[PDB]
Amino acid sequence: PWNPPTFSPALLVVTEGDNATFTCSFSNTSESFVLNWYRMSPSNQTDKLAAFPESRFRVTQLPNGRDFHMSVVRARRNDSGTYLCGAISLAPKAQIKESLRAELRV
């Protein structure tokens, strides 16, 4: 019943220098919210990369309303690792729900 956003796909494999696109889906619930893109560091700390209300990491909303493209522009081999998104709801209920994590390989 918590219904956290999804972070598609569990694994991106890309080549260095290439556009890498995750897609974070926050179902409906589009009245007062902020959407963060995170990457985990070796020490399991969470680093913000971009946010939907806002240049290497771009987050763009899709026509859907519910789907968001979270993309690395110039892929690298140290840009490589594990990522997730967080949905911050402000109304009706104050909430953060984070997606499950996915891997970027490049």
């Epitope: 007062s32 963060n36 700390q45 969470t46 946010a51 209300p53 911050i88 953060i96 729900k97």
Partner: antibody, heavy 127, light 112 residues
Framework: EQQLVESGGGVVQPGRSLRLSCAAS?????????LSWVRQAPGKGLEWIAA?????????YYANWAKGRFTISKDSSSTTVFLQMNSLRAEDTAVYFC??????????????????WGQGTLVTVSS | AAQLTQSPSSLSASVGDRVTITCQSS????????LAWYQQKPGKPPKLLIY???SLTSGVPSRFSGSGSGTDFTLTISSLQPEDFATYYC???????????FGGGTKVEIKR
């Protein structure tokens, strides 16, 4: 190194107002965080008053009993949150804590996840 | 309007004892588990013990566990330690955050 420090407590006379401050250290107010005021009268239990989303939108959340008598506000530029307390009455004598909720990596966050606290400031309402 | 009842108001136990503290809500908490438990010691701010909706990876020793869903919640200390004597508080969150409230607290004191 993250810290909350409450100030502005002291003796206040009944029927008057008092503004309290919560000064945060070690983090910025852009997003994922709410600051809350919680109070505790001498020898009694904890009581939640209100919360504010730090960050542009600035949404406020007020306990039912506190609505219309307390006002919470923020100043991102000095990472400070304010609690305005009006029509003070004797039963308002208490220690006032501010507490933070939110972050990243914890999976789910709500206003019940208060994981960072100040030491609190004593307000005595008395003539 | 939500009212959150905590029981008992105080109890006495010995080190090693199992203690259960219960917390009951007028209405279902948010998503049936927006409920937390806090430990407070005299003169000190409260400390978060259990965050039900996503069990902490913090330093709660195994002896602390929460159970319950919806309107009735339990905090269990399976093997009470000297550092556990303190007052414990539940905190409930609701569809409207304006209803959020603490229970009245449970003081756990040393039996003799």
């Amino acid at each position: 190194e993250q810290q909350l420090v409450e100030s502005g407590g002291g003796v206040v006379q009944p029927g008057r107002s008092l503004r309290l401050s919560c000064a945060a250290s070690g983090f910025s107010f852009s997003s994922t965080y709410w600051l809350s005021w919680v109070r505790q009268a001498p020898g009694k239990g904890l009581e939640w008053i209100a919360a504010i989303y730090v960050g542009s939108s600035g949404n406020t959340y007020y306990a039912n009993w506190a609505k219309g008598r307390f006002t919470i506000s923020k100043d991102s530029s000095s990472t400070t949150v304010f609690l305005q307390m009006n029509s003070l009455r004797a039963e308002d004598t208490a220690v006032y804590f501010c507490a933070r909720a939110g972050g990243a990596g914890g999976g789910v966050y709500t206003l019940t996840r208060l994981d960072l606290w100040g030491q609190g400031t004593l307000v005595t309402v008395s003539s | 309007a939500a009212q959150l009842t905590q029981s008992p108001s105080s109890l006495s136990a010995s080190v090693g004892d199992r203690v259960t503290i219960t917390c009951q809500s007028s209405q279902s908490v948010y998503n049936n588990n927006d409920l937390a438990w806090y430990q407070q010691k005299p003169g000190k701010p409260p400390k978060l013990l259990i965050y039900t909706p996503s069990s902490l990876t913090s330093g709660v020793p195994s002896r602390f566990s929460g159970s319950g869903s919806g309107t009735d919640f339990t905090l269990t200390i399976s093997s009470l330690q000297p550092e556990d004597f303190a007052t414990y508080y539940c905190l409930g969150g609701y569809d409207d955050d304006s209803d959020n409230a603490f229970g009245g607290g449970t003081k756990v004191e040393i039996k003799r």
